[PDB]
Amino acid sequence: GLLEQCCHSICSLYQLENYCN
Amino acid sequence: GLLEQCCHSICSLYQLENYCN
Amino acid sequence: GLLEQCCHSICSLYQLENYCN
Amino acid sequence: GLLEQCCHSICSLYQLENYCN
Amino acid sequence: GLLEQCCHSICSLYQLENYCN
Amino acid sequence: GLLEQCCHSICSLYQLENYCN
Amino acid sequence: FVNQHLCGSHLVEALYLVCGERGFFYTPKT
Amino acid sequence: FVNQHLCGSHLVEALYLVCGERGFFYTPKT
Amino acid sequence: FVNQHLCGSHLVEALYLVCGERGFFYTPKT
Amino acid sequence: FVNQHLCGSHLVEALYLVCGERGFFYTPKT
Amino acid sequence: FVNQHLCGSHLVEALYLVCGERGFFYTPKT
Amino acid sequence: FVNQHLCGSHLVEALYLVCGERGFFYTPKT
Ligand SMILES: [Cl-]
Ligand SMILES: [Cl-]
Ligand SMILES: [Zn+2]
Ligand SMILES: [Zn+2]
């Protein structure tokens, strides 16, 4: 869950890149 | 109250259109 | 597609839905 | 009006107030 | 602290200008 | 600088960092 | 359409989108 | 290019901040 | 001018509102 | 990169920025 | 001007607007 | 067209995310 982790928790730029194509 | 309903409560696209000219 | 289609001409909310789901 | 006036030239915050109230 | 005052407290347009160059 | 450089050509996140700190 | 609370400038952008050419009126205090 | 469409989005967000409680009317024309 | 780059930013925000729970895929190409 | 919670359209803009040409997929419900 | 809390990117856009040509400095940690 | 004015608004929002706690200075010139 993207929304579950980056909105409810904090995401490093790394974790954020997990959602790039 | 627009702010009262769509910000404090949820507005369907329908309810949102009530504020279009 | 999306960019070509919606940046050279205004896509309404209805036209944007085609890029959902 | 608003668009013609503020899209072909930069409207500062002071110039934008004229479109309030 | 800009963030401390305008985000956690309210800032008048005046207080906001304290952060302009 | 920033505007001249990043408005006439796309600055990625990596290129934008140079304008931090 | 999205199913979440819309506040501040996000409500304004939503109206801008939803209303299209119709334009809209925003009066937070009415 | 939809320059005007994009410009208007910024304009309404700016009016939101500038106008505050006073609110505003956005009319792509008259 | 990065018109396309700026336009795309608006597009994804609009899809966010339009698509809601359905989500969407953004591909600058195919 | 910023070290704060990213929600709603702010998460979408972050992905748009971070992903660049790669594009991204946004599925809030999965 | 608006009379509400300004945070994250909304505070940055407010400064961008309010400051105009003057430009501004944003230091959330100082 | 105010392309530069609109571009700058996006730029500051991007720096906000990219710079994080480090903050940044925005100067429309030198
Ligand atoms: Cl928010
Ligand atoms: Cl733009
Ligand atoms: Zn927000
Ligand atoms: Zn824009």
How is chain K split into domains, by residue range?
1-30
Q: Which chains touch H (3 or more CB pairs under 8 A)?
A: C, D, G, I, K, L
For ligand 3, the distance from its centroid to the CA atom of residue G10, given in whole angstroms, is 7
Method: X-ray
Residue B14 · residue B5 · CB < 8 Å: no
Cited resolution, angstroms: 2.0
Residue tagged 């304009």 (tokens): H11
Token output for L5? 């004015």
**HEC states along chain F?**
CHHHHHHCCCCCHHHHHHHCC
Report chain L residues touching chain F, CB-CB < 8 A. 3-4, 7-8, 11, 14-15, 17-19, 22-24, 26-30
Query: Rounded CA gap, K13 and K17, in Å?
Result: 6
Backbone angles phi, psi at J24, to 5 degrees: -155, 175
- Give Cβ neighbours of residue E14 (< 8 Å, ≥ 6 apart): none
Of the CA atoms within 13 Å of residue K30, those in its CB half-sphere come to: 9
Q: How far is I13 from chain G, CA to nearest CA, in Å?
A: 9
- Give Cβ neighbours of residue C1 (< 8 Å, ≥ 6 apart): I27, I29, I30
Task: Give B3's DSSP letter.
Answer: I
- CA dist list (Å): I27 to C4, D16, I24, J20: 12, 36, 10, 10
Query: Rounded CA gap, F20 and F14, in Å?
Result: 11
| Helix, coil or strand: residue I25 | strand
Burial of F4 (0-12, 13-18, 19+ CB in 10 A): exposed
Residue C18 · residue I27 · CB < 8 Å: no
